[PDB]
Enzyme design. Structure first.
Site, PDB file in Angstrom:
ATOM      1  CG  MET A  63      -2.351   0.566   0.889  1.00  0.00           C
ATOM      2  SD  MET A  63      -3.537  -0.681   0.239  1.00  0.00           S
ATOM      3  CE  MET A  63      -3.814  -0.104  -1.476  1.00  0.00           C
ATOM      4  NE  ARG A  64      -2.007   3.029  -2.829  1.00  0.00           N
ATOM      5  CZ  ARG A  64      -3.336   2.966  -2.963  1.00  0.00           C
ATOM      6  NH1 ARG A  64      -3.915   2.037  -3.720  1.00  0.00           N
ATOM      7  NH2 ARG A  64      -4.098   3.844  -2.322  1.00  0.00           N
TER       8      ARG A  64
END
Ligand SMILES: CC1=C(C(=O)O)N2C(=O)[C@@H](NC(=O)CCC[C@@H](N)C(=O)O)[C@H]2SC1
Ligand SMILES: [Fe+3]
EC number: 1.14.20.1
Length: 275
Positions: free
Chosen positions: A73-74
């Site tokens: 998750m970025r």
């Protein structure tokens, strides 16, 4: 047969000009460069410049406290620890090294997003398309920007279509000519270099979907240099994915009709499910 990649002023398009050409380019080769859309090589190069600044001159300390927590998750940095470093942003929950960085890169994001919205908006007007709930609601979405910097101066992945409405690439060139980015265009692989004052635009699966198949999402890939092309290959890319809000919707009999890897079932579906 036909492999060229066309160019357009967005201002000119908004003035009704070139209507047919732009229509056909979408449907037959879903990509194009784009002038006059309120992005500038200067702005880009000033942003690049302060990230590389941090790459080079930041302590172990400041990095750690703003490297990616959840690695997948970025938001934040990756691949900087003792081949590719990489910075990520979104609408919120972002992570910043200094105060001035925040400003420059928050503005850089906004400008990107506005441009993305504009071209997208044009893409719809042009296919006479009007999404459920409205053009604007749809364009007020959950976008994502990924910057990459390859420093210093052999596996081959397979082409993919982007999971986006549109995607905007701004790149800097290599000192030695090599293009990393290519795409399928009328049977063949065409180079997609840095062009001055231009910005590259892929249409994405979501584009195809929302226009009832009127727009092509080209398969594209990002090559590494052969083990002899390595000198003079430092490059960067700025890649702004215009992704919808989780709840957008699409009929699945329409989807597979353009060759899309969807292992899900039922009537229609939503963007969240698919990613
Ligand atoms: C276009 C693009 C770029 C890029 O650097 O340009 N890369 C990014 O920013 C990337 N995003 C990811 O890491 C997810 C990897 C997608 C795919 N391998 C998978 O999970 O099955 C890649 S894949 C998308
Ligand atoms: Fe891509």
């Amino acid at each position: 047969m036909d492999t060229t990649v066309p160019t357009f002023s967005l201002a000119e398009l908004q003035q009704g000009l070139h209507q047919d050409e732009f229509r056909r380019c979408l449907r037959d080769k879903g990509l194009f460069y784009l002038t006059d859309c309120g992005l500038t090589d200067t702005e880009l190069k000033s942003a690049k410049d302060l990230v590389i600044d941090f790459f080079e001159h930041g302590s172990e300390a400041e990095k750690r406290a703003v490297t990616s927590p959840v690695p997948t998750m970025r938001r934040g940095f990756t691949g900087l620890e003792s081949y590719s470093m990489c910075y990520s942003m979104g609408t919120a929950d972002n992570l910043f090294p200094s105060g001035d960085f925040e400003r420059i890169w928050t503005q850089y994001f906004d400008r990107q997003y506005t441009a993305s919205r504009a071209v997208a908006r044009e893409v719809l007007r042009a296919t006479g398309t009007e999404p459920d709930g409205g053009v604007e609601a749809f364009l007020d979405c959950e976008p994502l920007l990924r910057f990459r910097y390859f420093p210093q101066v052999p596996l081959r992945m397979a082409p993919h279509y982007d999971l986006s409405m549109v995607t905007l690439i701004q790149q800097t060139p290599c000192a030695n000519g090599f293009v990393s980015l290519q795409a399928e265009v009328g049977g063949a692989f065409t180079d997609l270099p840095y062009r001055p004052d231009a910005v590259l635009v892929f249409c994405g699966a979501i584009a195809t979907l929302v226009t009832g198949g009127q727009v092509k999402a080209p398969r594209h890939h990002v090559a590494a240099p052969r083990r002899d092309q390595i000198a003079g290959s430092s490059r960067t890319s700025s890649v702004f994915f215009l992704r919808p809000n989780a709840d957008f919707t699409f009929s699945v009999p329409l989807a597979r009709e353009c060759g899309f890897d969807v292992s899900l079932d039922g009537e229609t579906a939503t963007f969240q499910d698919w990613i």
